[PDB]
């Protein structure tokens, strides 16, 4: 095993982390922000660098920083968590380039997998099915452009190829309608992210998202385990998620898992990773691939038994996978709600400190967070501040005690999307289940 370990990152998944390396006698190096002092894990660590002010930019962006963090601590390898550098092909590069492990994927992978167009295609000739498209970046010649909405049909949507949020994304109905239409995403492209690349690609209507989780060891052995929906949203930000996902048959498992599994080999995938997929009658249409740890991993976790972040740390020590796809068993059920420091009507960020904090607690019912009483949480990062897992023998027992474990839990000082949460969970059609990806902002 890694002798130590950076975490470069922080809140839930730096605690979720730290709690893998000390299941695997791993030492820990907590890097942080100066806002970020009295986080859990930072208090938990076996060593702790503070490595700039509160902004990310300035601290877990920093990638100068980290780097000497790690070198000053005599650490041998660094997590990247999710968000922030994990899929940063520069920095897991300059991770090895200073002689580090970095638990992740080969840079070009990264990079291959980062940008939407090299990534369809690379899915393509591997076999993973992908949303019939433009394949490719659009350019202004409207007689064989506008000829790619027509061939594929609409509505289309726009999607920028080096886009990850509520940019880059513009739905196109109009035939006619589109000598100017590709114009609003691209001014929003280099305005994010810097790249103005756009393609184009079936908007489907009534998909699921469903994603596979993947395991690989970089040695050619790869596997799959099962799937997650994660169609309740807002701004495409996933709200619910939830393993297995209903409806799909152990066929339909195979089926597409046996090809996300063949296509890591394809690519020499190294690490945890996840492909997501719209899933419209019986039909898988890839969309992305992302090259870490997912936020959502613990509802695998709970139905497979696999500790997917003690699996990542197995492979970056040199570990060949210690789990056949014949030994992935999907056992019941389990549904996560993300807890996020928000208003649960306006959406308005709500920071601060936390005056009063019960976590629930019950068979089957999972707390993954880094709050506690008399904690502050910044205004500097992103608003989800935990995560609620339950696991039941089925659907229905695993809803159950989400009801409950949303009433039990006390956070107090700060606005919070329990409210949403428990409404969701009382909606008769997520109840029955199958729900679309529009489904929760029109409930909204
Ligand atoms: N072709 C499409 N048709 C309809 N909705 C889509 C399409 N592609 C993406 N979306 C919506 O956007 C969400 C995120 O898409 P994704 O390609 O993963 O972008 P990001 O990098 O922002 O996560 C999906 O879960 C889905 O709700
Ligand atoms: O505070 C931050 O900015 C770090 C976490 C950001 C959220 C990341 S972005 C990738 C992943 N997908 C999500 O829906 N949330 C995390
Ligand atoms: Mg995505």
Redesign the pocket.
Known sequence: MLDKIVIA???EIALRILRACKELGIKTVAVHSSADRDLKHVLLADETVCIGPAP?VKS?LNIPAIISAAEITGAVAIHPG???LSENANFAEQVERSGFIFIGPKAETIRLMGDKVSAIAAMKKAGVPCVPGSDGPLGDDMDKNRAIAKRIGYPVIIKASGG?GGRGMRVVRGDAELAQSISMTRAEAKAAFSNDMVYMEKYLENPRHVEIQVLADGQGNAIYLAERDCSMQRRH??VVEEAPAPGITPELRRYIGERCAKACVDIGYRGAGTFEFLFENGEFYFIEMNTRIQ?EHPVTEMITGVDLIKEQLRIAAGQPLSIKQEEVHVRGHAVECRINAEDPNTFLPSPGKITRFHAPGGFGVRWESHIYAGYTVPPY??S?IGKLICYGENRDVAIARMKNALQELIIDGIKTNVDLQIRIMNDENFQHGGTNIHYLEKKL
Do not use: A, I, L
Request: hydrophobic share 20%.
């Open positions: 990152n922080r809140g990310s877990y999710y968000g922030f990850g930000q996933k936020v990062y992103d989800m």
